[PDB]
Amino acid sequence: GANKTVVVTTILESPYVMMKKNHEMLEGNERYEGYCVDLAAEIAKHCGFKYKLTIVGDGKYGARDADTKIWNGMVGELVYGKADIAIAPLTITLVREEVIDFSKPFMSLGISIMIKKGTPIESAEDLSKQTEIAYGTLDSGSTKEFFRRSKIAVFDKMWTYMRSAEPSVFVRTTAEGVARVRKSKGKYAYLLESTMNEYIEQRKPCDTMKVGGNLDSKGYGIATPKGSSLGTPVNLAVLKLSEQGVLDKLKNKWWYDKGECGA
Amino acid sequence: GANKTVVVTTILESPYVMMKKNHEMLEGNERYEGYCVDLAAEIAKHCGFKYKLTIVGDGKYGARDADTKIWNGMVGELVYGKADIAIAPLTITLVREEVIDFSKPFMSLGISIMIKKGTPIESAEDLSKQTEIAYGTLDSGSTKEFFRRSKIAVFDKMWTYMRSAEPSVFVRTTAEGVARVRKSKGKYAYLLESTMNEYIEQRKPCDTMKVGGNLDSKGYGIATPKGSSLGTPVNLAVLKLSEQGVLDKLKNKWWYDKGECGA
Numbered sequence: 001g002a003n004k005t006v007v008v009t010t011i012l013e014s015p016y017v018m019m020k021k022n023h024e025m026l027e028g029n030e031r032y033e034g035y036c037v038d039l040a041a042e043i044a045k046h047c048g049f050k051y052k053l054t055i056v057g058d059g060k061y062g063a064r065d066a067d068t069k070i071w072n073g074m075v076g077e078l079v080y081g082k083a084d085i086a087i088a089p090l091t092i093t094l095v096r097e098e099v100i101d102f103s104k105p106f107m108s109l110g111i112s113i114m115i116k117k118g119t120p121i122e123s124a125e126d127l128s129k130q131t132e133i134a135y136g137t138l139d140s141g142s143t144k145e146f147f148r149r150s151k152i153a154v155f156d157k158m159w160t161y162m163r164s165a166e167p168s169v170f171v172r173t174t175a176e177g178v179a180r181v182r183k184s185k186g187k188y189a190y191l192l193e194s195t196m197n198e199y200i201e202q203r204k205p206c207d208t209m210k211v212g213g214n215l216d217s218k219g220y221g222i223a224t225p226k227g228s229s230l231g232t233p234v235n236l237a238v239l240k241l242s243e244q245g246v247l248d249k250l251k252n253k254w255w256y257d258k259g260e261c262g263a
Numbered sequence: 264g265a266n267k268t269v270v271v272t273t274i275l276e277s278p279y280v281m282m283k284k285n286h287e288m289l290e291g292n293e294r295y296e297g298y299c300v301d302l303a304a305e306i307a308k309h310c311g312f313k314y315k316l317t318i319v320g321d322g323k324y325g326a327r328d329a330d331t332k333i334w335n336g337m338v339g340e341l342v343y344g345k346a347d348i349a350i351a352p353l354t355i356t357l358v359r360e361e362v363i364d365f366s367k368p369f370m371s372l373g374i375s376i377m378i379k380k381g382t383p384i385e386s387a388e389d390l391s392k393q394t395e396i397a398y399g400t401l402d403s404g405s406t407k408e409f410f411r412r413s414k415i416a417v418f419d420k421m422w423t424y425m426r427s428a429e430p431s432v433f434v435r436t437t438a439e440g441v442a443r444v445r446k447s448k449g450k451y452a453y454l455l456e457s458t459m460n461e462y463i464e465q466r467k468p469c470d471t472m473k474v475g476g477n478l479d480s481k482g483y484g485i486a487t488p489k490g491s492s493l494g495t496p497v498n499l500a501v502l503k504l505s506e507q508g509v510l511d512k513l514k515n516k517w518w519y520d521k522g523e524c525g526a
């Protein structure tokens with residue numbers, strides 16, 4: 001029928017969406033800034049709709065409970081129809097693609113290792129063959145799933161360790177994993193997406209480092225409930241933005257341009 | 264209705280599809296080898312269909328004629344229903360996505376520069392600010408389109424030169440562009456996808472080099488005629504193969520493992 005204001009679910013995750021420092025003196029979409037804020041603006045213009053940014057209530061990306069089969073996070077919000085579109089760093093996975101539609105990816109990533117600077121680790125293989133340095137992942141996300149489902153020897157080795165490690169090596173938010181890297185004096189490494197890894201690397205206090213190659217090749221896509229009218233228009237808009245250079249321009253804006261660790 | 268042998272259009276393009284040296288003493292699919300041959304086998308198994316590999320009659324990727332509006336190449340073959348699926352290094356573009364369905368990408372690429380070794384060029388900017396060294400692209404493809412449609416200063420500068428260069432700087436096949444790089448004594452550089460650039464770099468006579476960063480970020484997707492029943496199954500199979508590590512394994516097989524220029 002007649003066009004509705006589109007409800008957008010997203011996640012507070014640097015540099016994609018952040019509360020502006022002065023958010024309290026602002027209302028609506030103006031409260032927020034970052035790569036996915038800007039991308040929301042572009043997609044909305046190109047598909048000709050009005051929208052409201054809403055941070056995902058539980059603060060999670062999206063995972064199905066093995067028992068209940070209930071989806072949580074931003075995926076949950078699409079699945080149960082609380083939100084019309086998710087515009088966030090949400091990784092295209094098989095388990096998600098079956099319950100929600102994904103645009104072609106708007107940004108690439110792969111799983112990667114953050115160390116505190118000077119940590120004697122260069123790779124995942126290094127992590128797997130030692131125990132002095134603890135390591136983990138975000139909860140409720142594609143990185144955790146990757147390790148749990150991996151048949152590859154080293155990642156299976158890593159997963160068997162991580163699932164049973166005491167204290168827990170898993171974290172609620174990316175900012176928590178980073179905090180743990182920075183405070184653990186080289187005795188914690190964090191497994192996170194290269195995109196986030198690279199952003200943080202170029203942020204004060206400039207004490208972290210991405211090491212080794214990526215463990216996989218995947219992408220973020222814009223997600224809509226299965227069969228939503230927004231799917232096709234959103235997918236075309238992503239490819240047009242790609243082809244206009246907008247995505248690279250936005251990547252430059254929120255990564256390189258934000259760099260505060262020198263050249 | 265009842266399952267038909269699926270007609271697969273593909274292109275002779277190293278290392279994706281090649282005639283085996285002994286192809287003449289072979290019949291059917293067995294004549295061919297390479298990354299997309301193997302990927303065809305996997306997709307077919309996972310979607311449970313039988314298929315016949317056919318090389319695209321005109322040897323082109325796919326471009327619409329400005330006058331007639333006729334699609335040529337593998338895109339043409341899908342559009343006019345000569346083929347049921349294209350399994351090849353076929354770049355996801357906006358103009359193609361409107362006339363055919365694309366899987367999520369199975370491999371990434373970006374536009375890149377091949378030089379003969381010792382050519383005093385490190386970038387696209389370098390190419391644009393000189394004239395002694397000629398440069399071009401493949402005909403009938405996404406790289407040519409990228410330059411023609413670019414509003415970015417340097418690529419617009421490059422396109423204005425390339426479209427009017429005498430003799431023609433455009434080539435019919437990748438193997439022709441490479442041949443021209445190798446025979447032109449450093450006086451030709453070739454603009455081609457990084458994937459192809461990287462393969463050739465590691466092939467005898469080991470006289471070529473990828474220089475500079477990629478001009479864009481795009482991907483290859485499996486393509487089907489718009490609304491084909493194969494679309495969704497093929498798309499899920501690509502994500503499952505990604506997640507099983509098959510795609511990386513196949514990338515290793517046909518790139519690194521084929522390397523004959525040392526380490």
Ligand SMILES: CC(C)S(=O)(=O)N[C@H]1Cc2ccc(Cc3ccc(C(F)(F)F)o3)cc2C1
Pocket residue numbers: 092104105106107108109217218219220239242354355356367368369370371372480481482483484501502505506
């Ligand atoms: C196959 C799935 C795991 S995925 O996450 O969708 N595909 C993975 C592999 C890959 C390859 C290239 C890219 C980069 C990119 C941007 C835009 C496009 C376009 F061509 F589709 F438009 O391609 C991302 C990914 C992630």
Ligand SMILES: N[C@@H](CCC(=O)O)C(=O)O
Pocket residue numbers: 061062089090091138140141142143144191192193
């Ligand atoms: N992008 C991930 C979250 C980050 C991570 O898992 O490392 C997801 O969509 O689940």
Ligand SMILES: N[C@@H](CCC(=O)O)C(=O)O
Pocket residue numbers: 324325352353354401403404405406407454455456
């Ligand atoms: N992959 C390209 C062909 C190679 C090129 O244009 O450089 C296409 O699909 O058109």
